Ligand code: HEM
Ligand code: HEM
C-alpha cells in the first residue's frame with residue numbers, strides 16, 4: 216500500500232528522471248544484462264552491445280511505462296494493464312526478473328542522484344517498483 | 357487478484373476445513389516447527405511438544421483467522437487488518453515465514469483431502485494464502 | 498544439513514513405496530500449472546493449454562519420470578548429493594539459466610504430491626527429512642561455488 | 644562463479660577507496676530502514692524508532708563498520724570466501740537463524756550504497772564484479788552444504 220508520503224516521493228523521483236528517460240532507461244537495462252547475464256536470454260533479437268539503438272529504444276519504452284504508473288499512481292493496474300498479459304501470459308517472464316530490474320533502476324538512480332536517493336525515498340521507490348511489477352505478474356494464474 | 361473461480365475454490369476448501377479448525381491448525385503449526393526449526397524461535401513461551409495445549413490453541417486461532425478471510429474474501433484486508441500491525445510492526449516477523457506457513461497448510465490439506473486438493477484448487481488456495489499473507493506483511497514500511 | 502539416521506530411514510522407506518512415473522508426472526504437471534512461468538522452459542512438450550491438457554500430456558509424464566528417477570539418485574547416496582548433480586547443475590544453471598527459486602518451488606510441489614499420495618504416513622518428521630533432501634538437491638543444482 | 648582478473652581488479656580498486664565506517668554505517672542503516680523486519684535481530688542497538696534515529700545510532704555505525712571490515716576479508720582472498728565465512732555462517736545461520744534472503748538484501752543494499760558514493764565510477768562492469776562478491780559472501784553465510 217502506497218502512502219501519500221510514498222507517492223509524493225515517487226513523483227519527486229520522476230521529475231529527476233524526466234529528461235533522462237532514454238539515458239536512464241538504457242543504463243538500467245545495461246546493468247540488468249551485465250550484472251545478471253541470464254537476463255539477456257529474454258532478448259535474443261536485440262544487439263546487446265553497450266549502447267545499441269535497440270537497447271536505448273527499449274530502455275526508453277520501459278522507463279516511459281514506469282512514468283505512466285507514476286502519473287496514474289492512484290491506480291497503477293489500469294495504467295499498465297496492457298503490459299500484464301504480455302509479460303506473464305505471452306512472454307512468460309520468470310517473476311524473479313522484476314526484482315532484478317527494480318534493483319537495476321535503483322542503482323542507476325543512486326549513481327545519478329545520490330542526494331535524491333535518501334533512505335526514505337529509497338523505501339517509497341522500492342514499494343512503488345514492487346507494486347508496479349506486481350501488476351505485471353498478476354496475470355500468471 | 358482472486359477470480360470468481362478462485363473464491364469458489366477457496367470456499368470449497370474451507371467447508372472441508374470447518375469442523376477441523378483446531379486439528380488442522382495444530383498440525384499446520386506442527387509441520388511448520390518440525391520442518392523449519394528456525395520458526396520455533398518466534399514462540400519461546402510455547403511448549404512446542406507434539407500436541408501441546410498451547411499449539412492447539414494457537415493453531416486454532418490462526419486457522420480461525422484464515423476462516424475470517426474466506427468469509428470476507430472480497431476484502432481480506434479489513435478482515436485481517438487487526439493482525440497486520442501486530443505481525444509486521446510489533447512482532448517484526450520475517451516475511452519469508454508466511455510462505456513456510458502457507459506451504460505447511462497446503463501439506464496438511466494434501467494429507468487430509470488429496471482429492472480436494474486438485475491442481476486447480478491448489479492454484480486458488482496458493483493465490484489466496486498469498487493475498488492473506490500480503491495483508492499481514494503490508495505494514496512493514 | 499547432514500542427514501541423521503532417522504531422516505535417512507524416512508527417505509529410503511518412502512522412496513521404496515514411490516512409483517516414479519505416477520509421482521513424477523503429477524509433480525511436473527503441478528509445477529507447470531501452479532507456477533505457469535515455468536512452461537517457458539518446456540516449449541517442446543506441445544499442448545500446455547490447460548490443467549487437464551498438461552495433466553494428460555505424455556511428454557510431461559515421461560519427463561516427470563526422469564525427474565523423480567533423478568531424485569532417486571540422491572536417495573541412493575545421500576552423502577554424495579553435490580557430486581551426483583554437478584552435471585545437471587551445469588545443465589539447469591550454467592546452460593538454461595533456470596533461476597534457483599524454481600528448484601525450491603518444484604521441491605515444495607513434490608512435498609505436496611508426496612503428502613497427497615501417502616496421507617497420514619507422511620508425518621511431520623517424514624516431511625522434515627524429505628524437505629532436507631529436496632533442499633539439498635535444489636542447492637546442488639544452483640550455481641556451483643568453490 | 645570464479646572471479647576473472649578484471650572482476651578481481653574492480654573489487655580491489657573500489658575497496659581501496661572504501662571508508663569502512665562511512666559505507667558500513669550507511670548500508671546497515673538502510674538495511675534496517677528499507678527492510679524493517681531485520682530490526683528484530685538488533686534489539687540491543689536501542690533507538691531504531693525512525694530513519695534519522697537509525698541513521699544517527701552509534702551502535703548501528705559501529706556494527707556496520709564491522710560488517711564492511713568483514714567484506715574486506717573476502718576482498719583480501721577472493722578464492723577462499725567459503726572458508727573465511729564458515730564461522731560467521733555458524734553464527735548467522737546455525738545460531739541466529741537469519742533467513743538467507745536477508746543476506747541477498749544486504750548485498751543489494753551495499754551495491755546501492757556503493758553506487759551512490761562512487762557515481763559513474765561504479766560502472767556496470769564494476770557492479771557485476773561486486774555483485775559476484777556479495778552473492779558469494781551471502782552463499783558462504785547460508786547453511787553449509789557438504
Ligand atoms: C518494471 C517492469 C517492466 C516494465 C514496465 C516493462 C515494460 C515493457 C514495455 C513497455 C515493453 C514494450 C511493449 C510494446 O511495445 O509492445 C516491454 C517488452 C518486453 N519486455 Fe518488459 N517491462 C518490464 C520488465 C520486464 C522484465 C523484468 C522482463 C524480463 C527479463 C521483460 C521482458 C520483455 C520482453 C522480452 C519484451 C519484448 C522485447 C522486444 O523484443 O521488443 N520485461 N516491456
Ligand atoms: C497466515 C498467516 C498468519 C495468520 C492468519 C496469523 C494469525 C495470528 C493470530 C490470529 C494470532 C493471535 C493474535 C491475538 O490473539 O492477539 C497470531 C499470533 C502470533 N503470530 Fe501469527 N499468523 C499467521 C502467521 C504468522 C507467522 C508466519 C509467524 C511467524 C513465524 C507468526 C507469529 C506469531 C506470533 C509469535 C504471535 C504471538 C503468539 C503467542 O505468543 O501467543 N504468525 N497470529
Ligand code: HEM
Pocket residue numbers: 528535538539563564567568585589593595599600602603604634635638
Ligand atoms: C522447477 C525447476 C526446474 C526447471 C524449470 C527445470 C527444467 C529442465 C529443463 C528445461 C530440462 C531439459 C529438458 C529437455 O530439453 O530435454 C531439464 C532436464 C532435467 N532435469 Fe530439470 N528443471 C527443474 C528442476 C529439476 C529438479 C529439482 C530436478 C531433480 C534432480 C531436475 C532433474 C532433471 C533431469 C534429470 C533432467 C534431464 C532429463 C533427460 O536427460 O531426459 N530438474 N530440466
Ligand code: HEM
Pocket residue numbers: 674681684685709710713714731735739741745746748749750780781784
Ligand atoms: C542482512 C543480513 C544480516 C543480518 C540480519 C545479520 C545479523 C547479525 C547479527 C544479529 C549479528 C550479531 C550482532 C551482536 O549481537 O553482536 C551479526 C554479526 C556479524 N555479522 Fe551479520 N547479519 C547479516 C548479514 C551479514 C553479512 C552479509 C555480513 C558480511 C560478512 C555480516 C557480517 C557480520 C559480522 C562480521 C558479525 C560479527 C561482528 C562482531 O563480532 O562484532 N553479516 N550479524
